[PDB]
Amino acid sequence: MTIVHRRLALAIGDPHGIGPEIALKALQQLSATERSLIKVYGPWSALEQAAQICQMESLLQDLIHEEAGSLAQPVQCGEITPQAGLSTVQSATAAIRACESGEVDAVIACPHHETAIHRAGIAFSGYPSLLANVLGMNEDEVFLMLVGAGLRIVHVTLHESVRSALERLSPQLVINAVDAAVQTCTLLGVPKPQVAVFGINPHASEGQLFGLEDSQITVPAVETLRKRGLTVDGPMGADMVLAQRKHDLYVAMLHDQGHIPIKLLAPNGASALSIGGRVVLSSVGHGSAMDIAGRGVADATALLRTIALLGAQP
Amino acid sequence: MTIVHRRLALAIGDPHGIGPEIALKALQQLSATERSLIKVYGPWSALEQAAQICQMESLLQDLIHEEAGSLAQPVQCGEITPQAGLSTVQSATAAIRACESGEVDAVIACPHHETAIHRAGIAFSGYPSLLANVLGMNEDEVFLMLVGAGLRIVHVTLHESVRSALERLSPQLVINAVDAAVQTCTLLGVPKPQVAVFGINPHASEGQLFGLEDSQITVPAVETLRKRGLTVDGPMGADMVLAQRKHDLYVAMLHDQGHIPIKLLAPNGASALSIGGRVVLSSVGHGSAMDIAGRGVADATALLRTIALLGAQP
Numbered sequence: 001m002t003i004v005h006r007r008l009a010l011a012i013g014d015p016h017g018i019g020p021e022i023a024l025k026a027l028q029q030l031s032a033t034e035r036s037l038i039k040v041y042g043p044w045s046a047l048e049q050a051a052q053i054c055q056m057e058s059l060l061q062d063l064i065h066e067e068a069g070s071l072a073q074p075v076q077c078g079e080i081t082p083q084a085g086l087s088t089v090q091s092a093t094a095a096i097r098a099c100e101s102g103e104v105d106a107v108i109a110c111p112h113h114e115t116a117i118h119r120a121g122i123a124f125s126g127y128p129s130l131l132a133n134v135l136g137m138n139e140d141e142v143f144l145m146l147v148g149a150g151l152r153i154v155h156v157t158l159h160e161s162v163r164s165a166l167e168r169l170s171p172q173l174v175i176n177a178v179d180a181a182v183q184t185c186t187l188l189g190v191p192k193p194q195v196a197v198f199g200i201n202p203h204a205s206e207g208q209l210f211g212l213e214d215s216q217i218t219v220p221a222v223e224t225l226r227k228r229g230l231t232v233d234g235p236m237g238a239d240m241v242l243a244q245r246k247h248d249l250y251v252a253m254l255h256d257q258g259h260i261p262i263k264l265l266a267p268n269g270a271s272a273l274s275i276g277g278r279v280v281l282s283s284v285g286h287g288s289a290m291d292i293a294g295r296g297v298a299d300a301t302a303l304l305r306t307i308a309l310l311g312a313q314p
Numbered sequence: 315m316t317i318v319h320r321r322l323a324l325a326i327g328d329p330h331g332i333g334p335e336i337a338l339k340a341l342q343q344l345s346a347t348e349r350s351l352i353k354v355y356g357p358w359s360a361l362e363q364a365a366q367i368c369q370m371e372s373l374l375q376d377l378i379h380e381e382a383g384s385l386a387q388p389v390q391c392g393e394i395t396p397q398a399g400l401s402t403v404q405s406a407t408a409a410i411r412a413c414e415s416g417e418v419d420a421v422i423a424c425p426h427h428e429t430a431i432h433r434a435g436i437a438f439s440g441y442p443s444l445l446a447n448v449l450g451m452n453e454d455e456v457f458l459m460l461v462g463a464g465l466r467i468v469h470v471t472l473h474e475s476v477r478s479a480l481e482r483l484s485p486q487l488v489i490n491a492v493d494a495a496v497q498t499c500t501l502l503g504v505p506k507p508q509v510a511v512f513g514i515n516p517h518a519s520e521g522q523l524f525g526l527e528d529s530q531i532t533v534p535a536v537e538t539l540r541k542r543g544l545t546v547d548g549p550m551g552a553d554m555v556l557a558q559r560k561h562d563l564y565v566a567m568l569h570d571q572g573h574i575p576i577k578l579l580a581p582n583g584a585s586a587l588s589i590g591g592r593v594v595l596s597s598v599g600h601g602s603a604m605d606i607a608g609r610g611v612a613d614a615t616a617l618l619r620t621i622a623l624l625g626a627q628p
C-alpha cells in the first residue's frame with residue numbers, strides 16, 4: 001500500500017524523453033503524505049508539458065520541486081538535443097547534492113539519453129562515475145551494488161581488467177565496500193544483514209593451495225569486520241556460497257563474479273545502486289524511449305519499483 | 315525408458331566406500347540389454363560384499379566385469395586404507411585405458427577418497443590430472459566441462475590462482491579447450507554445436523578500454539576457430555551472453571566464470587566431465603560417504619543421472 005518511507009530526490013532525466021511523464025505518473029499513484037517526501041529536480045517547463053499532455057495539471061500544485069536543468073527554448077518531445085543532455089546532468093547533479101547535504105536520503109534518476117549528453121560535450125560513462133565526479137571522489141571509492149531476485153551483491157572492483165582489479169585489491173578496499181553496502185542495506189530495510197564474502201581465487205584459495213591472495217586480503221578483512229560486530233562468513237568459493245542462498249549481502253571481488261548471478265536470475269527486474277558517501281543513487285532499468293515521448297505509452301512500473309526499493313521501511 | 319545408448323566403463327571407486335553399492339543399485343535399475351553395455355572395473359571381492367548387503371547376488375552373473383584393483387585382504391567397509399586408494403586408481407586407470415583403446419565410448423568413476431589415494435603414495439589433484447597421466451598428455455591439454463540445467467561450460471583454466479590463470483592464457487590454449495569440448499559435445503548428442511566464448515575481462519574488455527588481454531587472446535582464437543568452419547560467437551561479457559541462453563557450449567576463461575552459473579542453477583544436478591584425447595570421464599557429484607558404507611542406504615540417483623548424460627542417444 002505505502003511504499004515511500006523516507007525523503008527522496010527524483011531527477012526527471014532527459015526532459016525530451018519519457019522521464020517527466022513517468023515521474024508524474026508515479027507521483028500520481030502515491031498518497032499525499034508520500035508525495036510530500038519526494039522532491040523533484042528538473043525543468044518546470046518539462047513537467048508542465050508532460051502534465052498538459054497526460055492531463056495531470058491537478059498534480060503540479062501538490063508537488064515539491066526545485067528548478068534544475070532549465071532550458072533556453074520550449075521542450076521538443078522525442079528530439080535528441082545537446083541542451084536536453086545538459087538538463088539531464090544538471091538535474092541529476094542537483095539531486096545528488098541534495099543527498100550530499102542531507103536534504104534527502106537517496107536519489108533516483110529517470111532515463112538519460114547518452115547521445116544527448118555526449119553532444120553537449122560532457123563525459124558520461126554511467127551513474128557510478130557521475131556520482132564520483134559530483135562528490136569529489138575517485139571512481140574506485142564509489143561501489144556498485146546490484147539487487148535482483150533476492151540477491152544483493154556489492155562489487156569491490158568494477159569496470160577494469162582482472163589484472164588491474166587484483167593489483168588494487170587490499171584489505172581496506174574490501175572493508176570500504178562492505179561498510180558502504182551495509183549502510184545501504186539499512187536503507188533497503190535490512191538493518192542487521194548476514195554477509196558472505198567471495199574468494200578472489202577458486203575455493204577461496206583453499207588455504208594457500210591456489211594462491212596467497214585470499215590469505216593477504218579477504219581473510220584479514222573478514223576478521224577486522226567481525227571484530228566490529230558484523231555477521232560475516234568467508235571467504236568462500238563464490239560458486240559454493242552463492243548456491244546456498246542464506247545471506248542478505250554477497251561481496252564480489254570482480255565484476256563478473258556478481259554480474260553473472262544477477263543477469264542470469266533477474267534479466268528484466270534488477271536495480272543498479274551506485275553508493276558513495278551518504279548518497280545512494282539508482283536508475284530505472286530502461287532507456288528514454290524517444291519515439292514514444294509525449295505519446296502516453298510509457299507506464300511508471302519500473303520507476304515505482306525503484307522508489308519502493310529505495311523507500312523501504314526500517 | 316532407455317538411458318544407455320552406447321558402451322561405457324564404470325569404475326567402482328573406493329571399494330570401502332559406497333561406490334560398489336551405488337554401482338549395483340544403478341545397474342539393477344537398467345534393463346538387461348542396458349547392463350550388457352556397461353563394463354565394470356573393480357575388485358570382484360567388493361562387488362561380492364556390496365551384493366550380499368544390497369541383496370543383489372542375482373545381478374552378478376549377468377554382469378560384464380574386469381578384475382582391476384584387486385585386494386590382498388578382505389574388504390573393510392567404512393575404513394580409509396592405502397590399499398583401497400590404490401584399488402581406486404587402478405580401476406579408474408583400467409576403465410580409462412578401455413576408452414583410449416576404444417573398447418568403450420566414455421568412462422564414469424564412482425567416488426574416490428582423496429586421503430586413501432594419498433596414503434598410498436599416489437599424486438592426485440582430481441580426474442583431469444589422472445587422465446593426463448594415464449594417457450601421456452601434458453596436464454594443460456585436459457579440460458573440465460560442467461554440465462547442469464541445459465548449460466555446458468568448458469573451462470580453459472581451472473584449479474589455480476587468477477593471476478596464474480591469466481599468465482598461461484593463450485590463443486592456442488583457448489583453441490584446445492574448444493576442440494576438446496566440441497568433440498565431447500558429439501558424445502553428449504549435439505554434433506555441430508553453437509559456441510559462445512567468454513571475455514577474460516568485464517564486457518570482453520569493451521574493445522581495449524578494460525585491458526588488452528581479450529584483443530591478444532580470445533579475439534584471435536575466435537577468428538582462427540571460425541576459419542576452420544566452427545560456429546562461434548564472442549568474446550562477450552560472460553553475464554550478457556549467458557543470459558541469452560542460445561548456445562550449446564560456453565567457453566569460460568576462469569574457474570568461477572563457469573562454476574557460478576552451474577552451481578546456482580543446479581546445486582545437485584551438476585556433472586563434471588574431464589576430457590582428454592578421445593576419453594570423456596565423469597564423476598558422480600558426491601563423495602564416498604565412508605560413514606554409511608556397508609549400511610545399504612546410499613542413493614544411486616546421481617550415478618544414474620551421470621549414466622544418462624554420458625549414454626545419450628544421437
Ligand SMILES: [Mg+2]
Nearest residue numbers: 202203237238
Ligand atoms: Mg570458486
Ligand SMILES: [Mg+2]
Nearest residue numbers: 519526528529
Ligand atoms: Mg582487449
Ligand SMILES: [Zn+2]
Nearest residue numbers: 159255259516
Ligand atoms: Zn558492467
Ligand SMILES: [Zn+2]
Nearest residue numbers: 202473569573
Ligand atoms: Zn572446483
